[PDB]
């Protein structure tokens, strides 16, 4: 606190707040302008709170006092990353991991910068160098896995996933990503198993529930998909895509009225959404209330002229009304 190593601002950073920490570091750097990692704390605070150029300025001060500290370069590169100059970040990441060749987190930041830029293999070497430095950073191993899967080199990406899994069995994300890999390959039941394992290890890993329900309705195992989707909704109530999938499951189950209701909820959630329009109008027409089927189809076709399914359905209706010239044009 007073007349000591007042790491209390570090404690507030752990809390994530700024105010008392921010004034505390102000007071520090007019009482101990001796450490600069405190100024790095300041730049970091400005970073998360979107005080960008203030981060930059305090980083530049860090560059005065010891331009030998790679981490000022790291933060400068982060700044560049969210302000475009990614190449300069990359060369800074060179510079940093030349200054501290056995530094990990620089690898991670430069790998993110790389994947933003578009050079995969450099990022591969980033991650691999991280690993040969540390065989225990299972999270970066999963990141490896995501990148490799993005490169479609499936089997060894799955192998990295498994290595992380055995590295930390209690881990959760790796299970879901592995399940994604299997679902990509086609061995769906393995994927269902993996996703169930993931949600068992954590009832909060929402996207796992999304994937699980998605692949369940993929294989027409309806009721389990319903349960998974409802769990997802409880975990997060307010986005459309899950509502659309859930409502499609409802409709193919037969509960057409609930399908109408849930399409309505989805549409009101996200307006610019042609597919719910089309499916909802299908369910309406199959329920008999035509007079709004064409209305919804028109709304969809207005939103997207290219949405062919809506064209086919509306032309089917107008064929029912006999406007064959119009229907033929729509078919064309």
């Amino acid at each position: 606190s007073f007349q000591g190593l007042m790491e209390l601002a570090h404690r507030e950073y752990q809390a994530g707040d700024f105010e008392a920490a921010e004034r505390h570091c102000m007071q520090l750097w007019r009482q101990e302008p001796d450490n600069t990692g405190v100024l790095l704390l300041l730049s970091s605070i400005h970073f998360e709170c979107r005080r960008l150029d203030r981060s930059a300025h305090f980083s530049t001060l860090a560059i005065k006092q010891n331009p030998l500290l790679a981490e000022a370069y790291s933060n400068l590169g982060n700044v560049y990353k969210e302000r475009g100059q990614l190449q300069e970040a990359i060369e800074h990441y060179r510079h940093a991991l030349r200054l501290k060749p056995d530094f990990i987190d620089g690898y991670i930041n430069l790998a993110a910068a790389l994947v933003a830029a578009g050079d995969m293999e450099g990022a591969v070497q980033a991650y691999v160098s991280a690993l040969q430095y540390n065989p225990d950073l299972y999270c970066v191993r999963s990141d490896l896995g995501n990148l490799l899967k993005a490169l479609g080199r499936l089997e060894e990406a799955k192998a990295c996933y498994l290595k992380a899994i055995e590295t930390q069995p209690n881990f959760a994300v790796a299970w879901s990503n592995l399940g994604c890999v299997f679902n990509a390959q086609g061995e769906i039941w393995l994927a269902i198993h993996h996703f169930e394992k993931a949600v068992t290890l954590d009832p909060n890993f929402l996207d796992a529930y999304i994937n699980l329900g998605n692949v369940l309705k993929e294989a027409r195992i309806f009721d389990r998909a319903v349960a998974a989707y409802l769990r997802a909704l409880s975990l997060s109530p307010n986005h459309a895509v899950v509502h659309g999938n859930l409502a499609c499951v409802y409709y193919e189950q037969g509960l057409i009225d609930l399908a109408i209701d849930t399409y309505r909820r989805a549409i009101e959630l996200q307006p610019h959404f042609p597919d719910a329009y089309c499916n909802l109008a299908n369910a309406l027409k199959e329920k008999g209330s035509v007079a709004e089927a064409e209305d919804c189809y028109n709304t969809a076709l207005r939103l997207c002229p290219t949405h062919a399914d809506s064209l086919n359905n509306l032309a089917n209706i107008k064929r029912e009304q006999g406007n064959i010239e119009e229907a033929v044009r729509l078919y064309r």
Binding site: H10, Y13, N78
Partner: peptide, 9 residues
């Protein structure tokens, strides 16, 4: 990920 460095130095 900034450092938020803690070091005696």
């Amino acid at each position: 990920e900034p450092i938020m460095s803690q070091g005696a130095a």
